[PDB]
Symmetry: D2
Subunit: 260 residues, 4 copies
């Protein structure tokens, strides 16, 4: 249980982050959610976190590609919650092209969100965690923070950067009651992956499900997707006392991707 | 909860393995324990697992440096339990000396227990897990399965070997309902470490506690020991559904050792 | 020998890059040099590459923190040389502070030079290498592309990013006659390190040389600096036929830093 | 040049080790060769090292699965050469089967040769290198010292062990003029691989060359074999002064295998 904890999840209006926020609320944490989407859907998400799980939930819209807006988001989140105990740096985007064709603005947008926002969000959260002597920073990296694939230069660079940044954060705060770790998923069937499944299905002249199977066979030896729910369980474990001496490391849920 | 699971923990009469067995029993698993020590202490351990936690517990004495005895141990364990769902390959030993002074019999004894027993125990358990379509093999490696220190050639080689073997096990059994992962602890204050603390305290002319502090400062940025209880929580997480797609990987609880 | 090769070295007016350019010229390559410094020193560097080693050398001033200026640099370099066979992405900077005190403009400046310039320079070079069916991209990462230290968040993140980017580059160009690898130095006594040695000497109240010794003892088990000359030899090896199937990897010259 | 160096190559009657011995002799080192094969072929190998390259060469038959015979081999090699400057621990074997079917005697034979012989050979060589203040120990690991594949439990465990052991060796001897590094090849078309190519060709009902292509496509993004000659060049580089601060690390020549 994380009863009375105060949690922030970036990019929690979809996908993995939505499951992060749900599992943390189900464990008893109050939660700040964040991200884009349809306003009616976001408010139903917010209000149902409260009505299902009996916690407080707040939605703060911030485009975390802007540094100042990320730092201001953290301050607003902490004010809403009355503190900040668990920060999940989750928001991220993907774009695929070979390096020489890779758009300079997509490189800049993936580095800004997928790497720099993790730095700015961490910097703004740390003093709150340091003054209270307890904290969790849970960065959502990827198998692509440890290995590469073709056509994903910006994303692999950003995610490797998040793994490095996670290690620094942990070393700087070692013994202070604060841990920092990176969850590194393999394929999870969210919209970020569905786009790639569709691009495959068109490239190969096959249906969507045969395309999902080929996606998995290429990288993920279990031939099964990792689920958002499993990922939210991993974050609940990282938040637990058993994980008090787990810091500066990666937690790979990837169906065997990085074992080969 | 792991209610009704059937677990085996090698080297569970002391240290980390004793905490493994306790936490698994507290989660509801029946447990086979194993290892050396004083018979009165071992039977009190067995019987109190049952009387505290309401599970069945069995002690099977096997010296796991013998291959056949390890394979026969697994069969006897499975017969006792009526199955075998979770295998914790934990038993291990340490010896410190520079390579050119390192005793050939201590190299052979550390490779036999710390590496080969993990192979023989896995081989004997696998067909039971494959026929039922579910399993957990949890190997206790070390930070020394990922990095090295001086004077620990056999142990670092064995533990690196266990990390490799964990990856193979996971790949061969990917998608079958069986996962295999390696818990990689930093310093944990058990008798295996207390001996090194004492050797330090004599080398340096200092008390035991100043020696423990120097041990930690050299390797473990948190300056705190990892606890057996924390480690048993990590094994309970690896045994959970959230970890169904966590396979072939290492889970480092090391206070930041391997982040630097 | 690399007789008739055409090489580009970013940040080759000092330090490691100057030795890169020297060793490549001594192997027979024509060389483009780049970086800041005193104009008289830069022209003496250029002209002495030619007069000592009998190659052609060109100095192209570009601030590689600007993306367009990096891409325009590569085109100008290729025009100067009449081709582009070996690209050494070396220019980089350092800044030390804890995360919550780390200046947002220094994060942006280290990501721009130490990571994004490697991407833009690679993107501009690749089509030249792809059309000729031969190439070397040699990225200068760091031990800090594989592990972390305190107070170096931007730099560790950038260098991890360069290791990821090196892997992508290599995978996208596998079998085309082009390799991409990352040289990962430990401490090398250049101005980037001398500043840290001086900061230590002031923190500790000791002379500069005792400070250099403490720098080395903390991280580098050999207790000796890696030299720029050794690093230029590593790049000459990466450029050789023996390294035709060495791609997507790191080459650590770090006195044992990353072995522990 | 390695003029006047004294080198030992285990398992140098075939494959990679034969190329190791050739390249070292071509650089000017005297060489001890070792391994099984037809006596006429071994003596022609020995004598042609001398007659082509003008060095001294000696053949010492030792089965390095025996610890004492490995230690006695090193002493005999050093007596032959009048010293011992470069030790290449290369001899190794492979066997493929799933873990539960993997023969206990093949596990023991792969651990004995592929791991323990590297320990015994290193232990016997070290005091000779320590007394002279210079040495190279070059261990031939594999991509399978860093990642796994199915059906190769003993070999992946042994090779991971060699990577760990390489790190210890380097740390214990850091700053003494002795380095220890692991060359980690991807696929190299020697008899050890030809057997696997043939097993594939039968499994799939295809010719030998289509089977070699499928072997490469599964693991090695360049779609080209690494050559023994390239590997001997890597060992000649590790033996050079440029590599004086390269210690405790892996040098991957694997066509991109471990980048993904
Ligand atoms: N899906 C996978 O297979 C997979 C695998 C490994 C890692 N990841 C990572 O998991 C994380 C979540 O991805 P997902 O798959 O759930 O994707 P998703 O697209 O379903 O969700 C992305 C979330 O981030 C938000 N977001 C996007 N741009 C933003 C911005 N500028 N500011 C604030 N919020 C922004 C979106 O609104 C959404 O809430 C990402 O960091 C991604 O890199 C995903
Ligand atoms: N303590 C640490 O800091 C630390 C750190 C990393 C990894 N480890 C690993 O954790 C595991 C447990 O170690 P620990 O610290 O709890 O040590 P411990 O000495 O307290 O316990 C070792 C257990 O193994 C048993 N054992 C020893 N030889 C055996 C044999 N031949 N057959 C069967 N059982 C045998 C012992 O009786 C005991 O039950 C080992 O694999 C060790 O390598 C420990
Ligand atoms: N010195 C070390 O211990 C060490 C260790 C590991 C990695 N590195 C890396 O080695 C590389 C070279 O560093 P060094 O130690 O030789 O440092 P240095 O300071 O001596 O040289 C830096 C070079 O980069 C140039 N440069 C700086 N900003 C630039 C810009 N915006 N555009 C173009 N050129 C620019 C400088 O003018 C100079 O030529 C860097 O990537 C650094 O991160 C150094
Ligand atoms: N070929 C590859 O693709 C590949 C890839 C990665 C690593 N490796 C490693 O490279 C090394 C050399 O393998 P190779 O492919 O050249 O194989 P190879 O079979 O062609 O040569 C093996 C050499 O070891 C000798 N040898 C075998 N058993 C021995 C024993 N008990 N004592 C002494 N010598 C013995 C053989 O006689 C022969 O000289 C091995 O360590 C292997 O694991 C090979
Ligand atoms: C696996 C998935 C990710 O890393 O986010 C991707 O490659 O897009
Ligand atoms: C940390 C502890 C271990 O790895 O078991 C040791 O080095 O003895
Ligand atoms: C070692 C040196 C570097 O990585 O550039 C530094 O930490 O500054
Ligand atoms: C690649 C080759 C090796 O590692 O020796 C093999 O897997 O057999
Ligand atoms: Cl790929
Ligand atoms: Cl050490
Ligand atoms: Cl540090
Ligand atoms: Cl495989
Ligand atoms: Na709280
Ligand atoms: Na940002
Ligand atoms: Na059961
Ligand atoms: Na055994
Ligand atoms: Na390390
Ligand atoms: Na040319
Ligand atoms: Na740039
Ligand atoms: Na000599
Ligand atoms: Na042996
Ligand atoms: Na991999």
């Amino acid at each position: 249980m994380l009863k009375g904890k105060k949690a922030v999840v970036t990019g929690s209006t979809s996908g993995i982050g939505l499951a992060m926020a749900t599992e943390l609320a189900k464990a008893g944490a109050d939660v700040v959610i964040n991200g884009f989407g349809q306003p009616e859907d976001i408010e139903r998400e917010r209000s149902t976190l409260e009505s299902k799980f009996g916690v407080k939930a707040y939605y703060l819209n911030a485009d975390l590609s802007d540094a100042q807006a990320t730092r201001d988001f953290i301050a607003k989140a902490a004010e809403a919650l009355g503190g900040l105990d668990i920060l999940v740096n989750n928001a991220g985007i993907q774009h695929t092209a070979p390096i020489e064709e890779f758009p300079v603005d997509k490189w800049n947008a993936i580095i800004a969100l997928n790497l720099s926002a993790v730095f700015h969000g961490t910097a703004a959260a740390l003093p709150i965690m340091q003054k209270q002597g307890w904290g969790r920073i849970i960065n959502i990296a990827s198998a692509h923070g440890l290995v590469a694939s073709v056509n994903k230069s910006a994303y692999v660079a950003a995610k490797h950067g998040v793994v490095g940044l996670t290690k620094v954060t942990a070393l700087e705060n070692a013994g202070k009651g604060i841990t920092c770790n990176a969850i590194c998923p393999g394929w999870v069937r969210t919209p970020l992956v569905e786009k790639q499944i569709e691009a495959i299905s068109q490239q190969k002249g096959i249906d969507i499900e045969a395309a999902a199977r080929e996606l998995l066979a290429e990288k993920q030896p279990s031939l099964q997707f990792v689920t958002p729910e499993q990922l939210g369980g991993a974050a609940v474990f990282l938040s637990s006392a058993a994980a008090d001496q787990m810091t500066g490391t990666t937690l790979s849920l990837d169906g065997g991707w990085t074992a080969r």
